[PDB]
Amino acid sequence: GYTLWNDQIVKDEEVKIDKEDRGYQFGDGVYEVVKVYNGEMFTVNEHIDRLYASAEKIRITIPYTKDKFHQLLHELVEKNELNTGHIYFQVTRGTSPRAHQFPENTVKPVIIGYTKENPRPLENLEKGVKATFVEDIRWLRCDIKSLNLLGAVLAKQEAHEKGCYEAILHRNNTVTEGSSSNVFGIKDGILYTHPANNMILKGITRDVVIACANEINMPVKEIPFTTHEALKMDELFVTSTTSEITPVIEIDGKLIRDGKVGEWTRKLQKQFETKIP
Amino acid sequence: GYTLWNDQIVKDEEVKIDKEDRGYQFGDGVYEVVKVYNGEMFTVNEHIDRLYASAEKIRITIPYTKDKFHQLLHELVEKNELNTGHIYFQVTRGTSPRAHQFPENTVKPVIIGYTKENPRPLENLEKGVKATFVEDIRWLRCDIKSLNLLGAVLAKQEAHEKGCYEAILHRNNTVTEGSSSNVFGIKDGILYTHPANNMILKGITRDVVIACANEINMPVKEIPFTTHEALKMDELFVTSTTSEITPVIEIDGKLIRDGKVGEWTRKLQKQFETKIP
Numbered sequence: 001g002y003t004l005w006n007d008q009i010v011k012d013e014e015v016k017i018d019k020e021d022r023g024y025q026f027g028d029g030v031y032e033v034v035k036v037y038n039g040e041m042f043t044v045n046e047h048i049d050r051l052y053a054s055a056e057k058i059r060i061t062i063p064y065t066k067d068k069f070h071q072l073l074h075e076l077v078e079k080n081e082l083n084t085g086h087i088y089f090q091v092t093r094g095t096s097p098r099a100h101q102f103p104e105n106t107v108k109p110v111i112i113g114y115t116k117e118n119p120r121p122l123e124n125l126e127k128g129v130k131a132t133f134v135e136d137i138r139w140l141r142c143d144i145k146s147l148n149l150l151g152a153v154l155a156k157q158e159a160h161e162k163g164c165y166e167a168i169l170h171r172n173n174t175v176t177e178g179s180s181s182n183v184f185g186i187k188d189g190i191l192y193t194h195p196a197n198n199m200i201l202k203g204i205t206r207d208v209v210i211a212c213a214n215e216i217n218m219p220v221k222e223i224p225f226t227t228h229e230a231l232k233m234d235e236l237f238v239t240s241t242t243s244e245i246t247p248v249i250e251i252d253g254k255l256i257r258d259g260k261v262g263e264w265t266r267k268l269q270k271q272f273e274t275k276i277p
Numbered sequence: 278g279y280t281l282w283n284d285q286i287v288k289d290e291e292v293k294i295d296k297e298d299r300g301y302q303f304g305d306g307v308y309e310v311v312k313v314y315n316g317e318m319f320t321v322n323e324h325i326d327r328l329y330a331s332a333e334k335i336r337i338t339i340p341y342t343k344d345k346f347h348q349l350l351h352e353l354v355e356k357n358e359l360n361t362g363h364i365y366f367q368v369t370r371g372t373s374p375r376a377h378q379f380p381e382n383t384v385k386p387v388i389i390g391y392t393k394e395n396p397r398p399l400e401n402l403e404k405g406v407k408a409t410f411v412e413d414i415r416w417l418r419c420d421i422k423s424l425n426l427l428g429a430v431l432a433k434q435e436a437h438e439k440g441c442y443e444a445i446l447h448r449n450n451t452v453t454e455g456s457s458s459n460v461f462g463i464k465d466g467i468l469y470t471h472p473a474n475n476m477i478l479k480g481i482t483r484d485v486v487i488a489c490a491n492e493i494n495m496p497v498k499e500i501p502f503t504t505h506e507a508l509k510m511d512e513l514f515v516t517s518t519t520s521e522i523t524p525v526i527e528i529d530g531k532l533i534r535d536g537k538v539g540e541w542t543r544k545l546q547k548q549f550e551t552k553i554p
């Protein structure tokens with residue numbers, strides 16, 4: 001297929017990364033993932049906004065305007081004939097002789113973007129999945145969507161080895177987010193989720209779900225809960241650009257309530273469905 | 278020059294890195310830096326043992342034996358005609374379609390290694406440097422020498438913008454290590470340094486400096502110290518494969534004692550000198 005390399009659309013084969021690209025040596029870069037539903041990009045402006053926000057937090061100046069980057073993404077979708085799946089794009093500080101400090105503001109950032117066909121995980125949305133609690137050992141700037149994802153890969157692998165779909169991370173027993181998602185809990189018609197601070201990534205899906213809750217008049221409390229309190233919830237689910245609204249019906253062999261998708265989780269999924277292209 | 282690429286020493290122009298190499302997308306890899314003095318590698322075996330340990334901690338299997346990696350670095354040094362500088366080598370989990378969890382055991386790791394001419398830091402070793410305190414916000418597995426270095430690059434940059442050489446990190450007021458070095462303090466002829474746990478990298482230079490202390494009858498206590506205690510030290514200095522033993526004479530405008538390189542630092546530098554090829 002075709003890949004986005006800076007401001008050019010090229011065949012995958014023509015793309016080569018330099019050994020001294022800062023994203024290869026320091027994980028010095030940021031990224032985003034956007035879901036495409038039948039040719040249309042879902043919440044593309046919000047993801048672009050967050051990419052530029054993440055870049056700014058680590059002081060990376062993206063050389064193109066948001067309008068140009070938007071046009072670039074559209075061209076990438078049209079050329080790859082992407083129907084349903086997602087676009088992955090990242091920006092690193094650039095190539096420069098190895099040194100921890102920033103280069104000389106000449107080094108142009110390196111932008112890489114590509115597509116992948118991937119249907120909605122319908123079966124997981126319907127039946128729910130199994131999860132597991134894993135100690136959160138990541139750094140203290142989880143609000144930045146950077147390429148430093150080693151903590152998340154190790155947590156995801158521990159989950160996959162136990163036959164679970166996602167690892168629910170916790171710091172001192174206080175639930176934060178999943179290795180690649182945000183976590184929500186419902187008790188007596190009230191929606192609970194960790195507030196948006198340096199401890200979690202302010203997910204775009206997470207925000208759309210909170211909007212959906214306000215729309216159906218379901219109260220929301222952005223208050224942290226513990227692993228033990230999570231097990232005492234009536235319903236539990238995780239959110240991500242790829243997972244959408246995935247129900248968690250079991251954690252470490254302990255069923256959530258009856259082990260069935262709850263009443264409110266279905267009302268949110270239904271309200272979410274109205275926003276999809 | 279020539280670059281070590283997997284098991285072959287090739288021309289740099291022939292090396293091609295894939296966009297889906299896990300080192301580029303997740304910082305999923307480990308690395309090392311070996312110093313070379315007039316064509317001879319310093320503490321090679323120590324650095325090689327650590328590379329294998331680091332990889333082992335994140336479940337990466339290096340396909341060659343330690344003997345083959347050593348002859349390869351030797352070859353790399355011969356081919357590049359390296360006199361005094363360093364070798365940089367890294368190992369990533371490999372190339373595989375983007376997914377957080379480990380790929381199938383069929384994918385082989387990617388190994389990259391190269392050299393750089395860089396003289397010994399004469400001025401710094403003789404006159405000492407200025408450092409600055411920066412809060413440690415890195416992950417909790419600092420004992421692994423991985424490519425997830427964004428926390429370190431932001432700290433080092435903060436230090437450079439202030440006119441400082443190194444950033445001395447502290448986690449909840451307890452001094453851990455520097456953005457790219459280990460930190461030592463001296464009070465009453467006693468050597469103090471943070472113990473080797475998940476909070477710091479067990480540096481090779483660090484261990485050598487501890488071997489040097491025992492050789493000159495100097496008592497060593499691996500007990501952590503706070504920022505307030507660091508400023509009350511008689512002597513302060515940082516260690517690393519490239520900085521060797523660099524004296525820190527000031528931190529944020531506060532002189533360490535009289536602002537001159539102390540007596541025990543010099544003795545330690547003198548003893549270290551006897552180990553250099």
Ligand SMILES: Cc1ncc(COP(=O)(O)O)c(CNC2CONC2=O)c1O
Nearest residue numbers: 033179180181182201203204205240241
């Ligand atoms: C740690 C973490 N928290 C939350 C989310 C959910 O954010 P969004 O709702 O905006 O998607 C993600 C998405 N991470 C992704 C999405 O695909 N691959 C990733 O690395 C994540 O990695």
Ligand SMILES: Cc1ncc(COP(=O)(O)O)c(CNC2CONC2=O)c1O
Nearest residue numbers: 310456457458459478480481482517518
């Ligand atoms: C965080 C950190 N602690 C300690 C050390 C000192 O370890 P050694 O004594 O074994 O070198 C380093 C060296 N890091 C280096 C050395 O050069 N490039 C780097 O990233 C380091 O990055």
